[PDB]
């Protein structure tokens, strides 16, 4: 909340320490590309669980701008400490697919999040 | 208001004194009432529950809305059970005895 983040890109994890891995470096690397400037560049900030995001850091800490906030996506006090209202754009992924047996309620938590940071 | 800010923050928040939220404090709790030694006293042996109502109502402003009575009262005999039961909402010429509990809406006082 001290810091200002404006035209940043906020990264929304249901992430767990026994999930499975869903690869985040496919989501920087085109975010990371050389073809932008320094400048250019948008930070990227992930709210999430931080057990899941220490066995992903080993793929994203060579990456200039990216900062953790550990956290719940659907608490409303980290989504105003990001400055939601500011960023260019919020991305909510999923990761606890392969536990629910049902696979229509597979996407309960991103409906939710979203209906969540719509109100 | 309470559930939007709990909503908001996950948890309770709080804050210095003002007179609306003092004003905010006067409300009516759930209480029981024993007519041992209480004003009520000389109105519980044999006196009906109609006018413990209109006299609660009238002079405290209190709500009787039950009587919780020993299990062992209509009983002759003695007995050393303590256990009492509900009766809701009893007639006007309800009977009293004085080992009864009242139900009963208190207002805040200060």
Redesign the interface.
Same mark, same amino acid.
């Given at each position: 909340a001290m810091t200002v983040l404006s035209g940043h890109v906020v990264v929304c994890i249901f992430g767990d320490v026994s999930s499975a891995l869903i690869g985040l470096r496919n989501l920087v690397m085109p975010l990371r590309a050389s073809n932008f400037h320094y400048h250019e560049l948008k930070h990227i900030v992930f709210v999430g669980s931080i057990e899941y995001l220490k066995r992903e850091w080993e793929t994203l800490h060579n990456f200039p701008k990216v900062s953790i906030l550990p956290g719940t996506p659907l608490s409303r006090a980290d989504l105003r400490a990001v400055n939601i209202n500011l960023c260019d754009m919020c991305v909510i992924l999923s990761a606890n697919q392969n536990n629910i047996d049902d696979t229509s309620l597979q996407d309960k938590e991103c409906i939710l999040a979203s209906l969540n940071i719509k109100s | 208001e309470l559930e939007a800010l709990i909503? #908001? #923050?996950?948890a309770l928040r709080g804050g210095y004194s003002t007179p609306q939220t003092l004003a905010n404090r006067d409300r009516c709790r759930v209480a029981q009432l024993a007519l041992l030694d209480g004003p009520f006293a000389d109105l519980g042996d044999g006196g009906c529950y109609g006018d413990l109502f209109c006299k609660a109502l009238k002079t405290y402003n209190m709500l009787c809305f039950g009587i919780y009575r020993l299990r062992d009262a209509h009983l002759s005999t003695p007995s050393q059970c303590t256990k009492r039961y509900v009766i809701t909402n009893p007639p006007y010429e309800f009977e009293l005895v004085p080992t009864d509990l009242i139900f009963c809406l208190m207002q805040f006082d200060s």
């Open positions: - | 909503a #908001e #923050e996950n």
